[PDB]
Amino acid sequence: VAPTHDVTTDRSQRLTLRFVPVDREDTAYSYKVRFTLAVGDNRVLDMAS
Amino acid sequence: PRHGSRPFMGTWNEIGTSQLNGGAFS
Amino acid sequence: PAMLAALQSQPDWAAAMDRILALTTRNPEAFRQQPQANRFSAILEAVVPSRTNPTHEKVLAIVNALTESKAIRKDEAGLIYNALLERVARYNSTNVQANLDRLTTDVREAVAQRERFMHDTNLGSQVALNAFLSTLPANVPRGQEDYVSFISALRLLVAEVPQSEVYQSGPDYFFQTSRQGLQTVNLTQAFKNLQGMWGVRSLLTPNTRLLLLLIAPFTNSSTISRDSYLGHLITLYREAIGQTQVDEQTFQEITSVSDTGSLEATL
Numbered sequence: 544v545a546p547t548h549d550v551t552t553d554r555s556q557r558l559t560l561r562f563v564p565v566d567r568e569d570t571a572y573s574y575k576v577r578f579t580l581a582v583g584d585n586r587v588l589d590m591a592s
Numbered sequence: 593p594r595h596g597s598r599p600f601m602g603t604w605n606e607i608g609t610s611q612l613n614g615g616a617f618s
Numbered sequence: 619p620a621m622l623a624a625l626q627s628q629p630d631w632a633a634a635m636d637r638i639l640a641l642t643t644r645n646p647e648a649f650r651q652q653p654q655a656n657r658f659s660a661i662l663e664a665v666v667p668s669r670t671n672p673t674h675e676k677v678l679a680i681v682n683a684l685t686e687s688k689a690i691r692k693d694e695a696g697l698i699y700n701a702l703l704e705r706v707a708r709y710n711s712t713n714v715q716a717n718l719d720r721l722t723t724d725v726r727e728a729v730a731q732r733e734r735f736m737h738d739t740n741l742g743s744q745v746a747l748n749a750f751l752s753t754l755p756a757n758v759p760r761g762q763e764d765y766v767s768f769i770s771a772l773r774l775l776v777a778e779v780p781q782s783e784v785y786q787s788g789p790d791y792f793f794q795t796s797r798q799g800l801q802t803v804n805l806t807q808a809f810k811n812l813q814g815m816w817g818v819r820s821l822l823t824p825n826t827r828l829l830l831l832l833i834a835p836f837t838n839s840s841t842i843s844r845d846s847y848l849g850h851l852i853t854l855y856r857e858a859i860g861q862t863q864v865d866e867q868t869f870q871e872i873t874s875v876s877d878t879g880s881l882e883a884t885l
Contacts (some may be wrong), residue, residue: 544609547654608652 556586619686620726623679673715676722677702683725687732739783743776746785750792750806761817764848767840768812768833771829775836796832804828818846831855 560581568575582588605611640646646679649657658800681699684690690698706714718799735741751769759765772794776783791807808825815821822830830848834855841852872880 544653544655608648609656 556583619683619729620679620722622682623675626682627675627678631664632665634660638664654744673706673710673718674703676718677706680718681723683722723855738777739780742784742786744773746787746792747773747776750785750787751805753792755810758815759816761815762845764841764843765816766844767837767842768816770849771833771836771840775833778836787792794829794832802828802832804832812848815847818848819844822847822851827851831859835859 562578562580564576566575566577567583568577580588636642638649638657640649642648649660678699680702681690681695684698685692685695706718717782738744751773754769757766776785776794782795783796784798785806786795791805794804794806796802796804805825806829808823809829811821811823812826812829830851834852836858839854841848844851869880869884872884
């Protein structure tokens with residue numbers, strides 16, 4: 544049997560979050576994009592995702 | 593090439609009931 | 619023969635409402651943590667316990683008894699069990715379903731006689747001997763009455779050596795064993811060759827000698843005097859038994875120090 548109320552959450556979390564680029568500078572031989580990663584609160588993001 | 597890596601005092605799947613992946617059941 | 623039925627079936631309620639309620643000692647925080655499926659499949663048990671059907675169990679508490687005393691052989695408790703169940707599954711009723719209960723809670727308790735059966739061998743040792751002593755001649759042999767002391771040493775031997783000391787009646791002649799191994803089978807209707815020397819001061823076939831050597835340890839100042847032969851021999855057999863103990867410890871010592879060797883200058 545699975546484990547219950549203690550590993551999951553009924554509050555509306557998200558699974559896939561877009562992070563539209565904050566700032567996009569540039570050059571010829573290069574590319575700069577600076578997002579502002581927001582890990583919400585009580586969430587735990589693993590970088591591999 | 594090096595691995596180490598942690599998390600190994602065993603595992604839980606505690607009892608009073610048993611393990612995960614199902615054994616047999618789509 | 620019951621807990622072997624308990625420990626062959628029936629995987630309590632106090633132990634269940636002692637854990638859900640969290641009244642245990644070691645790990646009170648045990649039932650709380652389970653998935654909320656189990657905690658709702660063990661609370662509706664110690665809130666409205668579910669009945670049971672005990673027949674099988676105590677019926678299996680009777681088979682495990684028969685096959686341990688000796689009726690229904692070990693390999694037949696699959697026909698006996700079905701037959702008993704079906705009989706008790708026909709005529710069942712508070713009649714039988716109780717008459718069992720008594721049988722199962724008495725057969726495991728009325729086992730003291732069985733224990734006695736193997737603690738004074740009052741199954742084939744004294745009942746047989748106290749039968750054979752009633753087949754002996756009258757208890758007034760001509761020569762002497764050292765007879766009775768010997769015949770009592772026999773009973774003491776049979777009563778104080780539970781090992782097996784069975785007394786068969788292998789047809790007309792009752793024969794004394796010294797052990798289930800039986801490598802000292804002496805014929806006890808063939809010491810009507812001691813109703814000869816019961817009182818005197820090479821006519822003993824070793825069979826008689828075997829009986830003498832078998833009981834001697836249990837004779838002290840009983841068979842007594844210089845009542846011939848029967849007297850001494852018993853004393854000489856006891857002396858030889860003591861010397862045999864001495865030589866036994868000696869030989870173990872001399873073979874632990876280190877081939878015939880010791881066997882020569884011991885025997």
